[PDB]
Design a protein around this ligand. Structure first.
Ligand code: MG
Ligand code: ZN
Ligand code: ZN
Lengths: 79, 1337, 98
RNA sequence: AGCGGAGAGGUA
DNA sequence: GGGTATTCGCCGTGTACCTCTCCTAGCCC
DNA sequence: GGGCTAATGACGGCGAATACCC
């Protein structure tokens, strides 16, 4: 569940780019067709997003990797 | 879409480009059919379609004809919204002056023409003429004439020479003015005028010219020829209840202007005589000047019911203009309002919320999820389902409000905790349930307070809510590091009843294996809740690297403390729960829990405190009764002796042996002592009321009287209030402001009688009036403070410098009143801490001083710590991170962006609702004596006396820090001196307040030099002794015939020679001022330390804070010496008594007139430093800036207003006051321009000039020599390069007009204008966004 | 009292005031300062653009909620543009740059 | 869809 | 003529909300 | 009745505008 966003700050030391990384990710999970990378509790996209920030498998860098790499999938499918 | 905003004057070409037609007719509506007219104010063919895609004639009722205009009535078929932006115009017949540029005070036209405003008012109102195109005349170009002087000029130079009237003539002057010629001629006169006044007027003139030509303006543009009219939808004409139309003031105004204009054009065709059309143009100018800014002419015109109508200046200015009412604060959808109630069962990351509010708020969410589940096809079917309230949509709402935070607000939203996010849990009922701890943050009791809910719609907003504004985040105030989650009143009663101990009850002294048998005892009803028991407990310490070490013991405690101990998590020592736990104890309990264990166990720990607090406050049952308040029996006798004592003093006044003032002072003193005797009687007879047997004889202990437990817990009230319940209350003040001689001898437990209740009624009414008018100030204070900080975003990581201010713990003159480890705590050091193991480096030069480092500072007794402050932070357009330190709500350094200007100004201005509105030296403790800046001599007896005013007496302790500080006046008889050990409790000084002594320095003879009886000194025989003494008169009492002499005393030897100053070659003669009485007669061989003569002799409320940030020059300013060197006096009362200052090395052109009401500090033989004191009175801020520097004036502010809040005991950490000071002295002026481009006597902001010469440092050339200024907050707000924020603040007219003739352009770089324009704020998340956007351009 | 979305005012496309007119709450100035005190920008940016003033942006918002997107398109406050036509309706040329 | 200004009282 | 010195006109004066009434007259038709 | 219309009870403060004084 959700009580604090403490440890999310403990992996992202800005507490503001927490909001942009989280908004980028949860926007990629609501509009885009992607599953969560964490088992959900029938939560919303928000707590799933910050909850993925808790396990550290998403920050700004990995999101750069997926925008670039799925971007090259949009290049390689273009032929 | 767009960057910066530029503003300028209106060309008529630009006006005609804006418009789409000349509005000609004053009738608007037909009101028979509802169509408007051909070309009225409401016009279809100029402004566009009334209804949607239809012409007014009704030709093209189809969307297919979109774009083409019609021919029947010529209405361009478009959207009806196109009638919202299409402006109009009016070709006036006469030229017409704009009223703002006429009467902005200072007038732009007035100093533009070098012409007084009186005459220009006379020109525009047709009661004088004026010259244009003089030539071969005796008539100057600006010469104004009356009508009879126009007759004389009509005879004399009535030839081809011209002269006109009205705005045509002003149009001719501004039309025919050249610019560069007056730039050369008036810079030429800045050379040619030594006059400061002409230098000031002509430098304001030179700013208007050199800014006017640089701007895209023309002078004749100010006279409005073509008046633009407002689009009609913005000035609508609604029906009232009936077939009438509610009036707009605008349409009345334009109705008058179009009437007067059309009658004027008809008077121009028919060619009436000049006096009729003079009156017609005069009424037109009154009309347009009424429309632009009504009321700036001395009488307004009234529309109906005798009421001043609302011009466009009243469409912008004031509390109901667009900035106050429709731009900064907007009404918002997705919101609701309701009464709050408690619901204690909630956790603090959730709040209660009613069901019907939820179903009405969350309608689009319910609609979307019904489309998701397919239980509804269209928007009307879903809308009918949520109108129907089916049992499926409650499950849908329970889906969508699973993790959806909401933003609650309370209406007086003082500091930043006023909106907090929560999660809803749906409630059977109609009121918001709200978690109780949050009440203390909201300042919200449950007496009927109403709180509003808002809903974040977008996903970023939900993440901003849960990440930042969730209530678990806000546990520490930005004002101070204290917890704002303080358990307020019931829960602390449950604890102070829980953790208490009586000596004899159930289960005394037994042994129990842990707290689980304790709670098993208490729920069984076999042992007492409070009876002292040895138990076994097991605690944990995180001394290792986060590793919790176990230990167990058999503590002496009570049962309730064990039941409390089952809640407290692992990281705490048991001594946190071993005391009685009042309010301060539970507060620092929570604070240590956050400092040690972090956030999550602190939060859920606080919840478990609250639940067990109501469980045991509930189960305890602490009532209140009339038997609970105890009258002391000894009250009546102290009343009796009080009446006896005022009976005796009254008897002494009966025959008249004491004065009325003596009776008043004596009576108030004996009532005060009597009152405190009664207070000790009731306080003892409450606090040790209980006497119980211990199983032996007896013992006394603390009392279970309930009103004492509510007192000593600190839940409600104090010893003063519970004093007022039992003992007699007070000496109530009077409406005059004095005190009342008959105190209320009775309390609230007995009845009041009548007149005592009358006087107490005065006390209450004065209190409540102070609350209302007090808040009426306080909102305006916080208003100005946030409208002067406003701009200030933590934007860099380091300045990389080493300036700063010096924190020392303040010592007001007694005990230390704010220690070092509160002022220093959480701020980044300027350089390293040089330990007093001296040349030992305790902390480095950039380390944040958290609690460990502050303890290491504490053990080594660090005296003064220099530290990086925001006032000296060398950040450009911002504040670096390493000059601010802690957020005080996050236990680390500040993040880059969270705008400390606003959190500063709210955190300063919020406790203003809790403020108020309306000999010798006796040392205390035992230590070493240090003196500061001493110039002294040992007298004939051996006591030390000081010949310098500015010597400060410090009591250093045993270690080396200062622990007392004192002022030692001029010629004060000390008992001890430097390096001398004094005893704890010694009188260490003396002086006479009714004597300014003129003490000696060495010994020798004294000759009365220039002391002639009748001219400088006068003969007065002493009436009481016989050894008379000549009295030195002052300046004005003697006549001028013998005033030019200066009486002095020169130490001379047995030859008459010069006995000099020890060390220099000047004699020690004392030029005597007035009211000096030299007691020692002529030729007295004198000693050291003896008086050569005797010269005998506020409000700290909220307006103190206001006038500090306003920085007013106070009543009698303590004047200072601008520069060092020896000084003397000048001319006797040429208005004032002049000074003559003389430096040693530099020149001395500076001297200054002095008001002779001031007993000066300095003499003719006295040499000062620059910025040294000359007189007494308050210490005015400007001179403290321009003499003693920046650090002195910010230090004076923060210690001053910190004393103001510190007296009432509300903590504000100093950085907020410091950063408001940083916004105060942001502007500056120039001493020498150098290779820059500024005018020398010009004001510009320090940031822009610091980057100006800093980039002239990029070349080898020398930039400027700046000089900082100190503006008040309400003027430094308005003098801001962004004009739009200054339009949002006060005096909108002056801001916009100075913007207009300035041609000012605004790149906006700020907060409030971005609230205006409605984009992302460059504050937090939007500061990352402007990192992106400024990173791209 | 509560309000999702009801009527809009005439001279400014803003929610009405009061309860007898089915109107929203006033999100007043002091708590705009309080949002500035937090780092909440997107909260504020939808407080006084989408939920308040711009008619296009709240049509887009209403469509996006009923479809299942949470995203805002700012546009411009209408009321600021009204202020622009007011100051422009005096003898003042005021524009926007590129 | 049809809601602007005064003036009065109250609510915390 | 400068050099204060008064004085004299303008700006300001708490935050939301609730309830109610009451909203042009002149006038000659 | 009705279609249509053409004042005096603030106070503080602050910078320009005389006042007057030498
Ligand atoms: Mg209340
Ligand atoms: Zn037509
Ligand atoms: Zn810095």
């Amino acid at each position: 569940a959700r009580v604090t966003v403490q440890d999310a700050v403990e992996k992202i030391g800005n507490r503001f780019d927490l909001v942009l990384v989280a908004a980028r990710r949860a926007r990629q999970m609501q509009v885009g067709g992607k599953d969560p990378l964490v088992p959900e509790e029938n939560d919303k996209t928000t707590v799933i997003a910050l909850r993925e920030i808790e396990e550290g498998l998403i920050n700004n860098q990995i999101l750069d990797v997926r925008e670039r790499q799925e971007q090259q999938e949009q290049e390689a499918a273009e032929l | 879409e767009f960057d910066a905003i530029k503003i300028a004057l209106a060309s008529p070409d630009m006006i005609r480009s804006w418009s789409f037609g000349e509005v000609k007719k004053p009738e608007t509506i037909n009101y028979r059919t509802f169509k408007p007219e051909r070309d009225g104010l409401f016009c279809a063919r100029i402004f566009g379609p009334v209804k949607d895609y239809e012409c007014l004639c009704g030709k093209y009722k189809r969307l297919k004809h979109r774009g083409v205009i019609c021919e029947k009535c010529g209405v361009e078929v478009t959207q009806t919204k196109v009638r919202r932006e299409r402006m109009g115009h009016i070709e006036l017949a006469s030229p017409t002056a704009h009223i703002w540029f006429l009467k902005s005070l200072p007038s732009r036209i007035g100093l533009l023409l070098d012409m007084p405003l009186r005459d220009i008012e006379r020109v525009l109102y047709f009661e004088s003429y004026v010259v244009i195109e003089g030539g071969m005349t005796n008539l100057e170009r600006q010469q104004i004439l009356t009508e009879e002087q126009y007759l004389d000029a009509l005879e004399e130079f009535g030839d081809e020479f011209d002269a006109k009237m009205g705005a045509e003539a002003i149009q001719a002057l501004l039309k025919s003015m050249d610019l560069e010629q007056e730039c050369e001629q008036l810079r030429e006169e800045l050379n040619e005028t030594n006059s400061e006044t002409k230098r000031k007027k002509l430098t304001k003139r030179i700013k208007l010219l050199e800014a006017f030509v640089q701007s895209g303006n023309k002078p004749e543009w100010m006279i409005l020829t073509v008046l633009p009219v407002l689009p009609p939808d913005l000035r609508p004409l609604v029906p009232l209840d009936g077939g009438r139309f509610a009036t707009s003031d605008l349409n009345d105004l334009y109705r008058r202007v179009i009437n007067r204009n059309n009658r004027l054009k008809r008077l121009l065709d028919l060619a009436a005589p000049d006096i009729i059309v003079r009156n017609e143009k005069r009424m037109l100018q009154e009309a347009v000047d009424a429309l632009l800014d009504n009321g700036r002419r001395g009488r307004a015109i009234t529309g109906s019911n005798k009421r001043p109508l609302k011009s466009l200046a009243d469409m912008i200015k004031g509390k109901q203009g667009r900035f106050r009412q429709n731009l900064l604060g907007k009404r918002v959808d997705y919101s609701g309002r309701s009464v709050i109630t408690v619901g204690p069962y909630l956790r603090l990351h959730q709040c209660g919320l009613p069901k019907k509010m939820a179903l009405e708020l969350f309608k689009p969410f319910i609609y979307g999820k019904l489309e998701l589940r397919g239980l509804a096809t269209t928007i009307k079917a879903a809308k009918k389902m949520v109108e129907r309230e089916e049992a499926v949509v409650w499950d849908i709402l329970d889906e969508v409000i699973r993790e959806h935070p909401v933003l609650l607000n309370r209406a007086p939203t003082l500091h930043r905790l006023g909106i907090q996010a929560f999660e809803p849990v749906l409630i059977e009922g109609k009121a918001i349930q709200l978690h109780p701890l949050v009440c203390a943050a909201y300042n919200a009791d449950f007496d009927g307070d109403q709180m509003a809910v808002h809903v974040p719609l977008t996903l970023e907003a939900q993440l901003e809510a849960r990440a930042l504004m969730m209530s678990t985040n806000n546990i520490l105030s930005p004002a101070n590091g204290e917890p704002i989650i303080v358990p307020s009143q019931d829960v602390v009663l449950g604890l102070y009843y829980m953790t208490r101990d009586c000596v004899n009850a159930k289960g005394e002294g037994m042994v129990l294996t842990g707290p689980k048998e304790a709670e098993r005892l208490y729920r069984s009803g076999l042992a007492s809740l409070h009876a002292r028991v040895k138990v076994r407990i097991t605690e944990y310490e995180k001394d290792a690297n986060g590793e919790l070490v176990a230990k167990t013991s058999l503590k002496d405690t009570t049962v309730g403390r064990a039941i409390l101990w089952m809640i407290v998590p692992k990281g705490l020592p048991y001594s946190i729960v071993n005391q009685a736990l009042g309010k301060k104890a539970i507060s620092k309990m929570l604070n240590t829990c956050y400092r040690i264990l972090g956030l999550k166990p602190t939060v859920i720990f606080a919840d478990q405190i609250m639940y067990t607090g109501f469980a045991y406050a509930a189960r305890s049952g602490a009532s209140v009764g009339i038997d609970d308040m105890v009258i002391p029996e000894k009250k009546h006798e102290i009343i009796s002796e009080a009446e006896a004592e005022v009976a005796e003093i009254q008897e002494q006044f009966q025959s008249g042996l004491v004065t009325a003032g003596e009776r008043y002072n004596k009576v108030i003193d004996i009532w005060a002592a009597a009152n405190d005797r009664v207070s000790k009687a009731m306080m003892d007879n409450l606090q040790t009321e209980t006497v119980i047997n211990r199983d032996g004889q007896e013992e006394k202990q603390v009392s279970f009287n309930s009103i004492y437990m509510m007192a000593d817990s600190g839940a409600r009230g104090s010893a003063a209030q519970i004093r007022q319940l039992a003992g007699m209350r007070g000496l109530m003040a009077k409406p005059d402001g004095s005190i009342i001689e008959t105190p209320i001898t009775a309390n609230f437990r007995e009845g009041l009688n009548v007149l005592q209740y009358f006087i107490s009624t005065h006390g209450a009414r004065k209190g409540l009036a102070d609350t209302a008018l007090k808040t009426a100030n306080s909102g305006y204070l916080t208003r100005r403070l946030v409208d002067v900080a406003q701009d200030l975003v933590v934007t860099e990581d380091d300045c990389g410098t080493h300036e700063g201010i010096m924190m020392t713990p303040v010592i007001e003159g007694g005990d230390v009143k704010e220690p070092l480890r509160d002022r220093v705590l959480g701020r980044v050091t300027a350089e390293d801490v040089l330990k007093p193991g001296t040349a030992d480096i305790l902390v480095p030069r950039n380390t944040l001083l958290h609690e460990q480092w502050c303890d290491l500072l504490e053990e080594n007794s660090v005296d003064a710590v220099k530290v990086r402050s925001v006032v000296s932070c060398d950040t450009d357009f911002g504040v670096c991170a390493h000059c601010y330190g802690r957020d005080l709500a996050r236990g680390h350094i500040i993040n880059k962006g969270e705008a400390i200007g606003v959190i500063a100004a709210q955190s300063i201005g919020e406790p203003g609702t809790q403020l108020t509105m309306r000999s010798s030296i006796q040392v205390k403790n035992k230590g070493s004596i240090k003196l500061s800046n001493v110039k002294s001599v040992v007298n004939s007896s051996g006591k030390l006396v000081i010949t310098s005013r500015n010597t400060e007496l410090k009591l250093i302790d045993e270690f080396g820090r200062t622990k007392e500080s004192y002022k030692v006046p001029y010629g004060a008889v000390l008992a001890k001196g430097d390096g001398e050990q004094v005893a704890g409790g010694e009188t260490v000084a003396n002086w006479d307040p009714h004597t300014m002594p003129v003490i000696t320095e060495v010994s020798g003879f004294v000759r009365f030099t220039d002391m002639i009886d009748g001219q400088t000194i006068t003969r007065q025989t002493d009436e009481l002794t016989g050894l008379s003494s000549l009295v030195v008169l002052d300046s004005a009492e003697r006549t001028a015939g013998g005033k030019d002499l200066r009486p002095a005393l020169k130490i001379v030897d047995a030859q008459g020679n010069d006995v000099l100053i020890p060390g220099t070659d000047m004699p020690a003669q004392y030029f005597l001022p007035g009211k000096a009485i030299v007691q020692l007669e002529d030729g007295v061989q004198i000693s050291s330390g003896d008086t050569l003569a005797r010269i005998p002799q506020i409000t700290g409320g909220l307006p103190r804070v206001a006038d500090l940030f306003e920085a007013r020059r106070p009543k009698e300013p303590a004047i200072l010496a601008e520069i060092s060197g020896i000084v003397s006096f000048g001319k006797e009362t040429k208005g004032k008594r002049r000074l003559v200052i003389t430096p040693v090395d530099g020149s001395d052109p500076y001297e200054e007139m002095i008001p002779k009401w001031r007993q000066l500090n300095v003499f003719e033989g006295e040499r000062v430093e620059r910025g040294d004191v000359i007189s007494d009175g308050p210490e005015a801020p400007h001179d403290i800036l321009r003499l003693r520097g920046v650090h002195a004036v910010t230090r004076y502010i923060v210690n001053e207003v910190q004393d103001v809040y510190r007296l009432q005991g509300v903590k504000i950490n100093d950085k907020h006051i410091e950063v408001i000071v940083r916004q105060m002295l942001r502007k500056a002026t120039i001493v020498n321009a150098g290779s820059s481009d500024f005018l020398e006597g010009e004001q510009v902001e320090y940031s822009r000039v610091k980057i100006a010469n800093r980039e002239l440092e990029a070349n080898g050339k020398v930039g400027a020599t700046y000089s900082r200024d100190l503006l008040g907050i309400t003027k430094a707000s308005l003098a801001t390069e962004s004009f739009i924020s200054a339009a949002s603040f006060q005096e909108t007219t002056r801001v916009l007009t100075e913007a207009a003739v300035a041609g000012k352009r605004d790149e906006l770089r700020g907060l409030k204008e971005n609230v205006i324009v409605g984009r992302l704020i460059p504050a937090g998340t939007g500061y990352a966004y402007h990192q992106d956007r400024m990173r791209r351009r | 009292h509560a309000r999702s979305t009801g009527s809009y005012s005439l001279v400014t496309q803003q929610p009405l005031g009061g309860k007898a007119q089915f109107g929203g709450q006033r999100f007043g100035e002091m708590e705009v300062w309080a949002l500035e005190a937090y780092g909440a920008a997107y909260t504020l940016q939808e407080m006084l653009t989408v939920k308040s003033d711009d008619v296009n942006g709240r049509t887009k918002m209403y469509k996006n909620i009923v479809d299942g997107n949470h995203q805002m398109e700012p546009g411009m406050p209408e009321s600021f543009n009204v202020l622009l036509k007011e100051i422009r309706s005096l003898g003042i040329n005021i524009e926007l740059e590129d």
